[PDB]
């Protein structure tokens, strides 16, 4: 993703859950919906 990082204003870390590492193709099991919008400096994220 990235070579190096410059100054950082903010940093966040989250839960330990694991993700699907393998390449599989068939019925989509799950749906993840996201909305990304930045209003007034705020990066708002919504999901389901």
């Amino acid at each position: 993703v990235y070579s190096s990082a410059n100054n950082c204003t903010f940093e966040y870390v989250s839960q330990p859950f694991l993700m699907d590492l393998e390449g599989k193709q068939g019925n989509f099991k799950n749906l993840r919906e996201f909305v990304f919008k930045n209003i007034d400096g705020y990066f708002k994220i919504y999901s389901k």
Partner: antibody
Framework: EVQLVESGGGLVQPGGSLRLSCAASGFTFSSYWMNWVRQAPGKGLEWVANINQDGGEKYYVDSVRGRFTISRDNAKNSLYLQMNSLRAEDTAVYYC?????????????????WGQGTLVTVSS | DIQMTQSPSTLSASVGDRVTITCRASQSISSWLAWYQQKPRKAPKLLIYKASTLESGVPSRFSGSGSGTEFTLTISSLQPDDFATYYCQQYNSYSLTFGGGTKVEIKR
């Protein structure tokens, strides 16, 4: 001649396992998804399992999930389906068919080539 | 998931007549439907793909159309060879599903 010959059908008791195999010829086996569909006589045709061209991605119908594993040996040009914990219900004729690419999506062609079928009977 | 329901389950028509079997999906499959022909004990053969594209080598008598959720396979001039059960399938989403099957029989 694109051909698919299935082998391995037989009589099996409940709890038993079998592995059917389908030898393919006439096309580049490595490049295509292969599926196994079964027709159980009173009931209809049912889609059992599918494998991606790479062989990694594998999908199954819920009924079979722990029980059946589909696999393939490209060098061998063979596709296999190992079954476990056979139930009377699994009795059917199993056909190996060459599937289309899922990627095609809204334009899916369906299964172009089919084998003759292997009959497996599960009974005491 | 999606359920495909064909109708009629069985039909009898005379030779040369036009037969129309319909298939109805529980929800929009889009174009993802194909049709198969099956003879007794023989393995199924693919008639149509993408709802209306004829598979190579299949007779021109067979045609398939569809829009929305409802799709139809028509056989313009029924022939004696045509006796069989015809199935629709939707590849749109997993799991793949086939219709109940329509048995066609030659009326005499």
């Amino acid at each position: 001649e694109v051909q698919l010959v299935e082998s391995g059908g037989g009589l099996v008791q409940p709890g038993g396992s079998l592995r059917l195999s389908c030898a393919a010829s006439g096309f580049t086996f490595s490049s295509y998804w292969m599926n196994w569909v079964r027709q159980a006589p009173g009931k209809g045709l049912e889609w059992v399992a599918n494998i991606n061209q790479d062989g990694g991605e594998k999908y199954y119908v819920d009924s079979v999930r722990g029980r059946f594993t589909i696999s393939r040996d490209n060098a061998k040009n063979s596709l296999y389906l190992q079954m476990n914990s056979l139930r009377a219900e699994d009795t059917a004729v199993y056909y190996c068919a060459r599937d289309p690419y899922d990627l095609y999506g809204d334009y899916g062609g369906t299964f172009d080539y089919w084998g003759q079928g292997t009959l497996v009977t599960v009974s005491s | 998931d999606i359920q495909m329901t064909q109708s009629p389950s069985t039909l009898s028509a005379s030779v040369g007549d036009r037969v129309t079997i319909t298939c109805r999906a529980s929800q929009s499959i889009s174009s993802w439907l194909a049709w198969y022909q099956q003879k007794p004990r023989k393995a199924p053969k693919l008639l149509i793909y993408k709802a209306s594209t004829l598979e190579s080598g299949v007779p021109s008598r067979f045609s398939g159309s569809g829009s929305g959720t409802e799709f139809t396979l028509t056989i313009s001039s029924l022939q004696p060879d045509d006796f069989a059960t015809y199935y629709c399938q939707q590849y749109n989403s997993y799991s793949l599903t086939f219709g109940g099957g329509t048995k066609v029989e030659i009326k005499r």
